[model samples]
Target chain A: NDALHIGLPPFLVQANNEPRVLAAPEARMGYVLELVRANIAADGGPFAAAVFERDSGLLIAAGTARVVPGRCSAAHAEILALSLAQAKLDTHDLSADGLPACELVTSAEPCVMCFGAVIWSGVRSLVCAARSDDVEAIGFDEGPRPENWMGGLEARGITVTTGLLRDAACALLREYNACNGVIYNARC
Target chain B: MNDALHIGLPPFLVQANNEPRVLAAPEARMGYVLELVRANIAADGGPFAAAVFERDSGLLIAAGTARVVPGRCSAAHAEILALSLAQAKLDTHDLSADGLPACELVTSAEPCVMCFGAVIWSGVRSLVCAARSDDVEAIGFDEGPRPENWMGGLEARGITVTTGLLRDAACALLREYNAC
Candidate 1:
């Protein structure tokens, strides 16, 4: 047995600590936009997202930028909400055959790390509000996604939906840039 | 109305990354902190580093380094990363649980205002710095901590502090990051 190890890395735990009532896809997407706006208004961050149960469409949990700080770099809204949802569910295997049938809803197109998490999380569907270019235009790199990224996930049975709250999401990102949050580009 | 819950583990003991283990030798801490610094560099995070150690034993609980600007999210500062990882390690939301034992936060440089708040919220009992905030500022990033907020009155708030453990080494790390 491994004596000195961190039993399980956080990526494995699936506990949906923040549970919410059922809402329509449109309403849930609106809630995500509201959360992202509130975070920015409170001087938090420009991003937010949530996870939900697919069959019931009940919200599992939500995450806002810098809400968990430190891990914020990798802890995008998608990652945090998904992590908490997985923690509540107690499994990260999230295979189509896994425990809960879940969906991911985010205010913006996920960055590189978040995209990886979306696939690893085993969600049935992904919904986004803004595009990567829109976020990048505001000075934050949304990382890269190939043209066929959605097709690849679709092959794995994950449905893709985008532009649910596009204008509002883009507006928030622009506001964040106008307010001048720290923008560090590794590429630079 | 109470959102905090205590599951009842010993006040002074932590899962040490989720497995059963106690503190390593206190002398070993400097090396471990340095290793955490290197890990961040490897991740292209930043030269900065931060870590949390159990007070009673110098066991390294969790450590993190900077990921701001270069990373996609803004909350990836060293101190925040370390504390967040520590909280995740324990699988709990409230780090200031009454039953938890005293802990210490060690950083490669003095914390910024953002990191200071994170430390206070984390419930760690003491702060230790390897280098001054100026070391980080020298690299063009604003290290926004004021002395009055910490060295001047942190103890009044129940946080004990020690500064300048491995100054040259930590500075060396920062310079390395600056060069990139």
Candidate 2:
């Protein structure tokens, strides 16, 4: 992930998927990765090693020994996502999980386009990402104004939101969830 | 280029990268491979036979032929970048260079993000490319406000700007071009 995809030789030469490299990873990735990494390396041998495409990069925490990299159950995902969400919301009021009992739901790579869907579900969840980052111009969804286009849907009952846009997608995911979505009633 | 990477494999169980792959060989990509394909049936190639990874598959194009396939480029990079930029600006009532011009100063890619750097230099001269449908994404600066951070001399160039974003980044760039 450290080089530009000259898309030429040695595919990973310059894996600069983000426009601004280095500190720019913030502009590129979601924050989930940092937390995951910090937790993973507690007891390990190069836990950050790359597993090929086909391998299962999951982690399970068993009583005595932990053999996997991801949480072993739903309880973990909920706790981690909620914890991070709460942490982000501390300073930014817009990122708070206003719904006292909302459970974490689907967490995929955060897409500004999906904000509306998340709000409608009433499930305040954070996208569990490994990092936050910028996308290449070639890869950006520069098609029409994605947010403004969500307006019609917002009128229906679906809503989208953004919190701290400074950290690419997910951080903003938190900010948006903490918002008071314009109330929409399911009509006849 | 060969199958030496494969140690032991029968004809059936073994699959290649193109396994379950969509294949298309456009007339635009014909010139380069015409020597190996059907002669009379081969349509001419374009300036760039849009070759996928290994110069073999996908809708290919020649250096300067009629575009035949889906995603490929035959014009210079400047022409493509400028054309795309101009079209976007017009969609919003903004005016840019009437014609696309490109010049090379720095950068080594089909289309470098530093095209902004290109914007500063060779007004309309960039390396030629195949005939492909090109798209640009503002990437970092979008449905949000300003970026919390950038990088290096690039940061010094100030905030990265695009066709329209220039007005704002120009001011932002000058404001923080240097710090005490």
Candidate 3:
């Protein structure tokens, strides 16, 4: 469908897959990471992104990249991170929840991975903001993780995850049998 | 989109939501159940189904459906049942070795309350098949459940029983995962 037919024009042109190369200069990558953390913190209330921070320093930068439509995408990875951040804050934020706010960068585009990571994370207790994959344009839909991306965060280091076709709608309506909050929805 | 676009499509088509039914007709439900057992045997392997014969001859029939775009589908329920079946079957069959057949079924239509009873009576593992939702056709390349369906064999269930599309390929793939 992406080919042969043009669905609707995308909100923003996707970023070059090589984010480490294009959006690089660690500062830029860090900017992307902070943006994700800030957006999530805002959505879920402050102290939402404590884990992203290292010890207590606070977020500096983060970004990720992965093949669009390839198992997982950059957009999906970041979304999961955001969602996991929220989930973490939701369950554990009461203790002044001062967690790390580290930044990460990566590649991938589809939002499903974002949704999977976030939903699996068991941390959909916070909220956040997000820019589209293509930093050149304004974007919406935030990220797909919501409060579940935490599972993926710890499993796969969140420093720079990436993927393609990042979407969150699917994650919003997903279901798993357990819902126990202890098992990894997929790996569990 | 359909809700907003005001378009039209089948309602009992996705998981988390479906038009539940209740059929008290044992004969009819049994027929459907038998069909499912037969189908699984024909498609997957006969050994698992054959194992059902080794003991108390109470045939249990559960039904579910499958679908492509499962994660995104509104009416897929088989994946969940498949998992339940895989886990339950370990009781009757040697889960560590391979697996025994199950009594799961696919409904010519929607399943009802009576059929659900079968799931209860058959001892979740010994139970036939759980009525579920699925995609009638096949899955897309990218959207496919890796390899295919689920862990074959009737007696055992896998750790992951998808609640969506259940195709031949999906079944095959799951069987492979189970074996591994």
Candidate 4:
């Protein structure tokens, strides 16, 4: 294949058409939780994330993990959302001049991979719901994240916030695990 | 405007018919990867490249150059593209899946935080690197917050890592790219 293509599920694509503005963290995360739940209902991965204008709260792109279905291990929720946002914005760096400051809102804290992704994505801030411990408890490896993951992001000038809708996010993760959702890893 | 995310290979790499089918040694593989890096730089693309190959036969699977600038996706690093290309060609997320030969990823430079984490999920049994992250940073590129013992982390996960293959050549290329 000369190119690689990944598409958000049809339902999410249709949902994105409806105009909505989420001005609060709780509201933004509540929307992401809804995406995560939709992903699970569609038999997709447990994780979900979206990109939004940090100030205006405008949804830019939304994504769910498609690692297995997409047949690409790098297809994590954060990666997909950030990539789609970049495509939609027509620039690799969301922080580029003349653009609104952007943030990534995810249902769960990023693993090391997505953590690195958030940095390169040029997003000014990040918000998470479930903790890495919650993800690991459900049997999905978070990979080798540095001890100071938050500090690392802050060092790069990206603001970090966590535990938005914690109970709800963790509940979805547990539900996925309980239903025997695929816990795909490097070789597993 | 659809939901699709499309990342295309650089022009120089879209057709791999001119390259060797197999590279039997680490240096040989590094040489091939370095050439891709050089080509990438010549085309004004990112100064990095990577390829995936069968570990035993050394048969080339897929190779990619950095497309971050042209593709408008920060995640379009060489390692990520090559890994994803190989997966797409193989029709499976895990390269180590049953019935497939063991595969390895040969990167022109030490991966940044993003790519280092990518290797963990790439399913490649081995990782071979040419230049160090320090060399990349010397040219003003951020390697992000990679763990101090990143190699150890991969090893613990059962993936073998080989570093500094053709280092001088890789660094010289990076230095040249930076000078321009």
Query: Against the true structure, whose DockQ is highest?
Result: 4
Which regions in candidate 2 have their CA more than 4 angstroms from the true location? A1-109, A112-156, A164-188, B1-24, B27-180
Off by over 4 Å in 1: A1-23, A67-71, A95-98, A181-188, B1-180
Candidate rank order under DockQ: 4, 3, 1, 2
Q: Which ten residues in a row have the lowest lDDT in candidate 1 chain B?
A: B1-10
Residue-wise C-alpha lDDT for candidate 2, range A1-188, written one tens digit per residue = 11000011121111111121122222222222332233233321111111011112111110100111211110122222222222222311112354232322222222322232223223332322212123212131211123343353345343323232333334323433333136743320
Judged by DockQ cut-offs, the docking class of candidate 3 is incorrect
lDDT (tens digit, per residue) of candidate 4 on B1-180? 676788866677877523558889988888989989988887768999999989988899998888899889999999998999899889999998999999999999888888999899988999999998889999999898888899999999888999999999999999988888
Q: Write the per-residue lDDT of candidate 3 for residues B1-180, one digit (tens) a residue.
A: 100101111222211122233333433343433343344433322211111211123333223333212222211223223222333333321222334443333333222221222222233343232223232222211121111222232223322222322234334533442443
| Local accuracy of candidate 4 as per-residue lDDT tens digits, A75-172 | 99999899989998899999999999999999999989999999999999999999989999988889998989999899889999999999999989
Predicted candidate 1 versus true structure: per-residue lDDT over A1-188, tens digit per residue = 10111121221122234446656878888888878776665445688888888778787767666533332233456756765565455454444355667888888877645665676567878999998888878776653343466775687788999998798888878777777636764431
Local distance difference test, candidate 1 = 0.63
TM-score of 3: 0.23
- Residue range B70-128, candidate 2, lDDT tens digits: 11211112222232222222221111234422111111112222222222221222222
Best-to-worst ranking by TM-score: 4, 1, 3, 2
Root-mean-square deviation per candidate? 15.0, 22.0, 18.9, 3.4
Candidate 4 DockQ score?
0.71
Instruction: Give the DockQ of candidate 3.
Output: 0.03
